[PDB]
Amino acid sequence: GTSKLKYVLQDARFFLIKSNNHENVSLAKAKGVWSTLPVNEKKLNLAFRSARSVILIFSVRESGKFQGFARLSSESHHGGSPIHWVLPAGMSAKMLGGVFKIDWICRRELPFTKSAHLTNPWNEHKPVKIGRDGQEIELECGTQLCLLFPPDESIDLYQVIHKMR
Numbered sequence: 001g002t003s004k005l006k007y008v009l010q011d012a013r014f015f016l017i018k019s020n021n022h023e024n025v026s027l028a029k030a031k032g033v034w035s036t037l038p039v040n041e042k043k044l045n046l047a048f049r050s051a052r053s054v055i056l057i058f059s060v061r062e063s064g065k066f067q068g069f070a071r072l073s074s075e076s077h078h079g080g081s082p083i084h085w086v087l088p089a090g091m092s093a094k095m096l097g098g099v100f101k102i103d104w105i106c107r108r109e110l111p112f113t114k115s116a117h118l119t120n121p122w123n124e125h126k127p128v129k130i131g132r133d134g135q136e137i138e139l140e141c142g143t144q145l146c147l148l149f150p151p152d153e154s155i156d157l158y159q160v161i162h163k164m165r
Ligand SMILES: CNC(=S)c1cccnc1
Pocket: 020, 024, 034, 035, 036, 037, 085, 086, 087, 088, 096, 133
């Protein structure tokens, strides 16, 4: 192991990403990308410049689980390869902001039952599973949440460490 993981998470910022469906998380895992609404895009871009690591922790709505977590490797950009997201009903692709590149740190799931002892000070100390898309998770809570995930032995954090910074 957990030492490189702890190193990557040291003084990180953490954001809860709430996905409408599993398809979009599958695309994010396959392509190493995420795109969010402009209100959250601006927050993530600010955070990317502010901290050594910015961690997105993903949860598919109604799944009762987190599906993994990833580290921003870039601010958002436009004009790249299109991504065929499965958008919420009533939302067009033009409503999204740009695309963030991300490096996955853990592609394994964690059920909410395992994080019930973690509360987020930045959301009224509600359980960390509770939060709108884009809710920031305070450092200690976010670190402990990430450490609860099963180890993902397919991941080598050596290359992520070199990107820090
Ligand atoms: C791929 N991004 C999607 S589906 C989304 C939708 C609404 C808010 N944030 C993100």
